[PDB]
Design a protein around this ligand. Structure first.
Ligand SMILES: [Cl-]
Ligand SMILES: [Cl-]
Ligand SMILES: [Cl-]
Length: 390
C-alpha cells in the first residue's frame, strides 16, 4: 500500500578526506593549496534521488579554522555550467557563512531541491579570506573549477588553467526519501577511487555498479565511493590508515547497509622502496581486516570483501616483489575461506590474465599492470551479484 511518509537522509555521494601536507616518513614536508577570495565549483554524480539534500563540509585535517563564506548548490549542465533556475543557498543553522575549527566536519541544513538518481549537481564554495585547505580528496577523477571573487551563483565560472581534479573540504552529499533505501559503501584505494578511469566520465567501478543497479530497477540502492588513492590498512599515507578511518568512512556513512571492502595492495607494494621502515606481513593485514569486519557486523552491516587483483609487472622490484606476491596469496586465501564475512567478490578471478593468472588481463590493463582501465572497472562491477546488495 501507501509507503509510510516518514522521511530520512541517505548518503548519495561521498569522498574520503586526506591531509595533503602529510608525507612519507623521512620526506620533506608538503604545502597545502590555498584559496584567497576565490570560488571552487565542484561537480558530483548523485547515486540516490529525493526531495531535499544536505552538504557535508570538512576541515578534518586543517591546522587552523576555515570559513566557508558562501556555499551554493545547483543542477549541472556540463563543464562549469549550472541551471541557475535550480540555484539554492546552502545554510548552516540558518547562516550562509560557517567556520569549521580544525579537525571538525559539519552537515548543512536541508535544502529544498528535488534531484534524480544518476544526475550531476554542482556544489560551489566561496572563500573570501585567505584559506589554507589541507583537507582534500586528492584524485576526484572529476574536474573542479576555480575563479576569482564570489561566483557561487554564476551561470559558469570565468577563469581556464585554474582547474583541479580534487575536492576541497567537501566530503558527503546526503539526500532524503520516504522510500526504503540501501546504501552500499565501497571502501578501498586507487582501484576503488577509479584512478586511470576516464575523467568526468563517471566510469569508476562503483559508478558502473550503480549503472547496473539502476538498469535492473533498483533506483533505491545507492553506491557511494570511499576509496583513497595509495591508501593502506596499517599506516598513514596515502590518506589516514584504513583502520583509523574505518569508523568515519564506513560505519558513520548515513544509511549504510552494505560494504564492499577492497584494500591491501599498497600495504604490500610500499615496503620495497617507498616505505622500507613499514614492512608488514599478511597476518598483520588480516588482523586489521577482521577488526574492521567484526565492527561492521556488530552494527548490522552486510560485509563483502574483495580479493586482491593480480599485479605482476607493476614496477618489478620496487612495488611488486615476490614477498608481495606471497602476502597477496595468503590474504586472498583467507578472504576466500572466511566464514566471518557475508560474501566474497573475487575481483582477482574476474580480472586476471587467462594467459597468466599472476597478471591483470591485458584488455583490462590501464598500462601500468596495477590500475584497470574503464573496461577493467566495468568488469569489476559485472563480477558483483546484485542479489547480495538487496
Ligand atoms: Cl585459494
Ligand atoms: Cl559476487
Ligand atoms: Cl536481484
Amino acid at each position: 500500500g501507501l509507503v509510510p511518509r516518514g522521511s530520512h537522509m541517505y548518503a548519495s555521494w561521498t569522498a574520503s578526506m586526506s591531509d595533503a601536507t602529510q608525507v612519507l616518513p623521512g620526506a620533506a614536508p608538503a604545502a597545502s593549496q590555498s584559496f584567497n577570495n576565490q570560488t571552487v565549483r565542484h561537480v558530483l554524480r548523485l547515486s540516490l534521488g529525493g526531495n531535499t539534500l544536505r552538504v557535508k563540509v570538512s576541515n578534518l585535517f586543517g591546522k587552523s579554522p576555515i570559513t566557508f563564506t558562501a556555499v551554493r548548490v545547483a543542477k549541472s549542465t556540463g563543464q562549469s555550467n549550472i541551471d541557475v533556475s535550480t540555484d539554492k543557498s546552502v545554510t548552516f543553522n540558518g547562516q550562509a557563512s560557517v567556520t569549521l575549527e580544525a579537525g571538525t566536519e559539519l552537515v548543512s541544513d536541508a535544502v529544498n531541491l528535488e534531484v534524480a538518481p544518476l544526475t550531476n549537481i554542482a556544489v560551489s564554495m566561496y572563500f573570501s579570506s585567505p584559506t589554507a585547505m589541507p583537507t582534500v580528496h586528492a584524485l576526484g577523477v572529476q574536474t573542479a573549477f576555480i575563479g576569482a571573487g564570489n561566483q557561487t551563483a554564476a551561470t559558469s565560472i570565468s577563469a581556464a588553467a585554474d582547474q583541479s581534479q580534487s575536492y576541497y573540504g567537501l566530503t558527503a552529499l546526503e539526500v532524503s526519501s520516504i522510500q526504503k533505501t540501501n546504501v552500499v559503501v565501497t571502501f578501498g584505494d586507487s582501484i576503488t577511487d577509479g584512478y586511470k578511469s576516464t575523467v568526468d566520465a563517471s566510469k569508476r567501478y562503483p559508478n558502473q555498479l550503480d549503472d547496473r543497479l539502476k538498469t535492473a530497477g533498483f533506483s533505491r540502492i545507492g553506491v557511494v565511493n570511499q576509496g583513497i588513492s595509495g591508501n593502506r590498512w596499517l599506516n598513514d599515507f596515502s590518506g589516514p590508515s584504513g583502520t583509523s578511518r574505518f569508523d568515519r568512512d564506513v560505519l558513520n556513512v548515513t544509511g549504510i547497509t552494505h560494504a564492499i571492502i577492497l584494500l591491501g595492495v599498497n600495504d604490500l607494494g610500499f615496503s620495497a622502496w617507498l616505505a622500507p621502515t613499514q614492512t608488514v606481513t599478511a597476518e598483520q593485514v588480516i588482523a586489521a581486516m577482521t577488526t574492521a569486519i567484526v565492527k561492521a557486523k556488530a552494527k548490522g552491516i552486510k560485509v563483502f570483501v574483495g580479493t586482491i587483483i593480480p599485479f605482476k609487472g607493476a614496477s618489478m622490484g620496487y612495488y611488486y616483489t615476490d614477498a608481495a606476491e606471497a602476502k597477496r596469496q595468503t590474504i586472498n586465501t583467507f578472504i576466500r575461506n572466511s566464514k566471518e564475512i557475508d560474501g566474497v567478490i573475487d575481483f582477482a578471478d574476474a580480472l586476471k590474465n587467462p594467459a597468466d593468472p599472476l597478471t591483470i588481463n591485458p584488455i583490462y590493463d590501464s598500462g601500468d599492470a596495477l590500475h584497470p582501465n574503464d573496461a577493467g572497472y566495468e568488469a569489476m562491477a559485472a563480477a558483483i551479484d546484485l542479489s547480495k546488495l538487496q
